[PDB]
Write a protein that binds this DNA or RNA. Structure first.
Ligand code: MG
Lengths: 226, 216, 493, 32, 45
RNA sequence: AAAAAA
């Protein structure tokens, strides 16, 4: 693998046009491209994969947020603790209305995507994609349980279909699941013992971080509750 | 003027009312207090008396407008943002429906300016808010605030209404108002200059950012 | 099109407002106070003029609720939505059957439907009443003057009436149908007491019922007969599960001791009295409803569209005429002329019949025929505004009030004041020589420049002066930065 | 002492060493 | 061919330039070999 | 310191 360090020279020649991305920084004065994080450089597209527990607002990202406040203009939703609030408009719901407002209390789990996210402006999310049949699991998440994981474990789970988690958990139990890019995973089952079994697995899988240890953990966790 | 030219705080200048004889008719001079003066009450011969008394050390000026105005000019405080004045401000934060700033200097009248000295790391500096509808006369309804102003950019505006005792309400609707001084990437890059009214370019790194520019 | 039921009514509409609102109540069942004693008129106060009071005002307050509303009973599940069917009542023969059917019930859920576009006061269209095991849909068009017999059930304190937002329902009941409610329980006010996020009906059918609905047919015309499938779906859905929510909310209130407050606010809703805009109280209240609660209703119209206080006489006549025609042909003021089109008449002011017809998007029917008259009202208003078309003055009378020789007196008393005050001052001259810190503290700023030898050299005070003169001169006039950009797309002549 | 970098677009009428910093401009803008 | 376009830099009084920007007020001084306190590069107090 | 009916 090719490991990258901040401040190091950029291997990619400046001759051929290359689109930017997360992980690299374009100097507003010297106009030189330099890495600002530590990880593996992926060139297809140029970006850097680095370990981070803190999520930042970005366009077209699926996130699971919690309503921390209800205003007259929009909703105040926290995608993560201590981070700045996000603006969820009333018109950001399917079958929107003028006078009539969507029913959401403080503490309700919402599965939405980030539409407009500026660095110097308050981010905004919408409870309907733009668009994928208006139903990618978007909306209020009733009951269930959520778990905090690092951003590395969250993105690989949602995007990569070769990740042996949804594959190994589907065999142990039948359930619906929603994964956000802010390190939040929402899983709901029928019986509470199944949800608890799923929580303990992801908690241990994220800690150990091993692709081939998924089946081993899931086997001993589901047999522990019985 | 038959009245003392130099006046220290507490020095008597002129009584309440005055009159003179000219052209076979009595002309009534009405003395009114002004900046640096204060109408107070004195006692003498067992009888009350009201007279204009200077409260600031400086020279006395008697002027008339289309009545005699008595004011004392020192050798800032008097200058305060009022409806119609032009004010140089700096962007403190950006929201979606508006843009709040802080007042630095105020344009005088016939350029010269009056710099308001205050601590910017406390919040004692006067704060002002520019509404999204007050950005430009062109398309007042839909205006993208991100493509107009920027944190740190200097904006020349004109105050409409003072509102409450917290924030001032400015506007950049006209041509001579808008972002004056700004740099690339929120101040990280080089200096940028105003070319088009809705476009600001930088003749150094070749960077171009969308702002609300004024007329040179 | 659709024929208005006003012509099909046994009694013609009266938009005269020449007399205070007289209740259409004929028989007064379940009342301990005689009708003749409540048919009188209240004494006129400063704000309240002469008017007929609420008939059951003495019945609503004094009467007691059934002791079974004060106990916590288990919820009663609503009948199956797909299995149960709504019963339509369009004849008096099946109205009597429903009347005796409501008398053997403990509580009923009632909600109204209204249309205010083809009528001035508006007209009650559909009334949906639902019990525990069945639902009803009562037509208030054909059956209107005969619905007064429902007061036996509606004014009975033993039977609990379950409404939602009855603040407008009580008005519509007593105005058109002459119905009154004694023993009301408004689920809306109950939702407020609990602290529910939304006090709407769609939320109560969601959280406490799990029956997803939506606002589709509300402003829609309900006068159309017969009723379609999605309309009759929304019609019955209002009062169907309403009895289920009634028990659930009632149990919430008892354990939280908030039941006394809800029934209190419910009675105040049931005692709401309708009255015309003319004979309305001068003091605005929530106990008396009227179409216009402001003495000058054209005031708020101007401030909304930024109309200056000059064309007020124009917008007044345009408003009064719009109300005159609306009360003539029995139509809504917006149907005669919308506010947006009226604004075009105030802003543009067409002096001819050509400028009146063609404005904005479209023009309604009422102002099209009277467009010639509208051209005259503008010419009359412009004639009126042109018919009507103290600083030193107020001071001058005050200067002649005070004595003129007194000015010479107060000046002499001023001259003798200064000469006997500031003119006398004698003290031995004392040097301002420094005692301690007076030598070093106010020290003038000096600068030094070390040379190649390392010897300190005092910078002249004139040196820094020409430095400022050089800077202020160079900064005042900046050299215009000129940079050229290639343009291969441009061509010469 | 301080060390600053010059900006060509701010000329009137490549680092420079400054001695004895003072006021607000030399204190806040100079990070060396 | 070539398109020559000039721009007019907005100038401010010396006391206003300092309030607007601390760096800009310093650069204008350093260009003439002077400092905001009206001293040269190596001039002390 | 928005809210309910139609
Ligand atoms: Mg209803």
């Amino acid at each position: 693998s090719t490991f990258i360090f901040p401040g190091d020279s950029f291997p990619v020649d400046p001759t051929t046009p290359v689109k930017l991305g997360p992980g690299i920084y374009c100097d507003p004065n010297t106009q030189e491209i330099r890495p600002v994080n530590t990880g593996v450089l992926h060139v297809s597209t140029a970006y850097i994969d680095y370990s981070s527990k803190r999520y930042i607002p970005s366009v077209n990202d699926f996130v699971i947020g919690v309503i921390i406040g209800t205003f007259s203009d929009s909703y105040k939703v926290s995608l993560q603790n201590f981070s700045s609030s996000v603006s969820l408009s009333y018109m950001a719901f399917p079958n929107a209305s003028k006078k009539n407002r969507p029913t959401l209390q403080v503490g309700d789990l919402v599965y939405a995507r980030v539409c407009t996210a500026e660095k110097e402006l308050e981010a905004e999310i919408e409870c309907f994609d733009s668009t994928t049949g208006r139903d990618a699991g978007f909306g209020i998440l009733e009951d269930g349980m959520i778990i905090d994981v690092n951003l590395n474990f969250a993105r690989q789970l949602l995007f990569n279909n070769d990740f042996p988690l949804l594959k190994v958990l589907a065999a142990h139990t039948k359930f619906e699941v929603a994964i956000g890019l802010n390190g939040k995973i929402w899983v709901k089952c029928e019986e509470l013992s199944n949800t608890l079994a799923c929580y303990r697995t992801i908690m241990e899988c994220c800690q150990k971080n091993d692709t081939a240890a998924f089946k081993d953990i899931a086997k001993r966790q589901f047999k522990e509750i019985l | 003027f038959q009245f003392p030219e130099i006046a220290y705080p507490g020095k008597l200048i002129c009584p309440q009312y005055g009159t003179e004889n000219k052209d076979g008719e009595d002309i009534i001079f009405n003395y009114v207090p002004g900046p640096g003066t204060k109408l107070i009450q004195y006692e003498h011969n067992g009888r009350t008396l009201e007279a204009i008394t200077a409260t600031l050390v400086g020279t006395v000026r008697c002027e008339e407008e289309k009545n005699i105005l008595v004011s004392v000019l020192p050798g800032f405080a008097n200058n305060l943002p009022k409806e119609g004045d032009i004010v140089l401000t700096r962007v403190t934060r950006l929201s979606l429906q508006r843009a709040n700033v802080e007042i630095l200097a105020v344009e005088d009248k016939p350029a010269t300016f009056s710099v308001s000295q205050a601590s910017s790391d406390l919040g004692e500096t006067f704060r002002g808010i520019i509404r999204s509808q007050d950005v430009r006369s062109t398309d007042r309804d839909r205006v993208k605030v991100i493509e107009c102003f920027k944190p740190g950019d200097i904006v020349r505006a004109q105050v409409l209404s003072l509102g409450d005792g917290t924030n001032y309400y400015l506007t950049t609707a006209r041509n001579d108002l808008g972002v004056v001084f700004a740099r690339a990437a929120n101040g990280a890059g080089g200096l940028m200059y105003a070319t088009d009214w809705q476009m600001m370019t930088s003749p150094v790194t070749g960077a171009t950012e969308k702002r609300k520019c004024a007329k040179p | 099109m659709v024929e208005k039921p006003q012509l099909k009514f046994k009694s013609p509409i009266d938009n005269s407002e020449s007399h205070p609102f007289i209740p259409l109540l004929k028989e007064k069942p379940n009342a301990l106070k005689p009708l003749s004693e409540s048919l009188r008129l209240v004494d006129d106060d400063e704000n309240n003029p002469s008017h007929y009071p609420h008939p059951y005002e003495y019945e609503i307050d004094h009467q007691e609720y059934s002791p079974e509303i004060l106990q916590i009973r288990e919820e009663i599940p609503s009948k199956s939505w797909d299995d149960s069917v709504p019963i339509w009542v369009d004849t008096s023969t099946e109205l009597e059957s429903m009347l005796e059917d409501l008398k053997n019930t403990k509580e009923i859920a009632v909600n109204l439907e209204h249309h205010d576009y083809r009528s001035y006061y508006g007209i009650v269209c559909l009334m949906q009443i639902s019990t525990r095991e069945r639902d009803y849909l009562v037509d208030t068009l054909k059956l209107r003057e005969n619905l007064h017999i429902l007061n036996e059930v509606f004014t009975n304190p033993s039977i609990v009436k379950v409404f939602h937002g009855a603040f407008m329902d009580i008005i519509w009941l007593q105005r058109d149908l002459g119905l009154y409610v004694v023993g009301l329980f408004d689920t809306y006010h109950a939702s407020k007491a609990i602290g529910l996020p939304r006090h709407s009906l769609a939320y109560l059918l969601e959280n406490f019922a799990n029956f997803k609905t939506s606002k589709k047919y509300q402003l829609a015309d309900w006068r159309i007969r017969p009723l379609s499938k999605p309309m009759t779906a929304y019609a019955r859905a209002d009062t169907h599960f309403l009895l289920n929510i009634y028990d659930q909310l009632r149990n919430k209130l008892i354990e939280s001791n908030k039941l006394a407050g809800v029934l209190y606010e419910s009675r105040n809703v049931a005692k709401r009295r309708f009255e015309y805009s003319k004979y309305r109280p001068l003091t605005p209240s929530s106990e008396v409803y009227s179409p216009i609660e402001k003495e000058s209703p054209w005031k708020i119209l101007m401030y909304q569209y930024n109309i200056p206080p000059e064309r007020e006489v124009l917008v007044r006549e345009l408003y009064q005429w719009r109300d005159l025609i609306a009360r003539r042909d029995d139509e809504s003021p917006r149907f005669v002329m919308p506010n947006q089109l009226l604004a075009a008449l105030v802003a543009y002011t067409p002096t001819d019949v050509i400028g009146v017809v063609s404005l904005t998007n479209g023009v309604t029917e009422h102002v099209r025929q009277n467009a010639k008259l509208l051209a005259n009202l503008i010419r009359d208003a412009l004639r009126n505004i042109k018919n009507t078309n103290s600083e030193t003055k107020a001071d001058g009378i005050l200067l002649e009030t005070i004595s003129v020789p007194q000015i010479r007196d107060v000046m002499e008393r001023f001259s003798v004041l200064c000469n006997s005050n500031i003119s006398k001052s004698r003290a031995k001259p004392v040097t301002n020589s420094s005692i301690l810190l007076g030598k070093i503290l106010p020290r003038e700023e000096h600068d030094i420049a070390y040379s190649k030898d390392g010897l300190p050299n005092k910078v002249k005070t004139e040196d820094i002066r020409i430095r400022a003169q050089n800077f202020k001169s160079a900064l005042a006039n900046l050299e215009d930065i000129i940079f050229e950009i290639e343009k291969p797309l441009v061509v010469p002549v | 002492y301080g060390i600053v970098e010059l900006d060509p677009e701010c000329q009137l009428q490549n680092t420079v060493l400054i001695a004895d910093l003072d006021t607000e401009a030399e204190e806040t803008s100079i990070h060396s | 061919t070539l398109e020559t376009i000039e721009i007019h830099p907005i100038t401010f009084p010396p006391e206003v330039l300092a309030r607007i920007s601390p760096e800009l007020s310093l650069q204008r001084h350093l260009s003439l070999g002077i400092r905001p306190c009206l001293r040269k590069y190596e001039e002390f107090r």
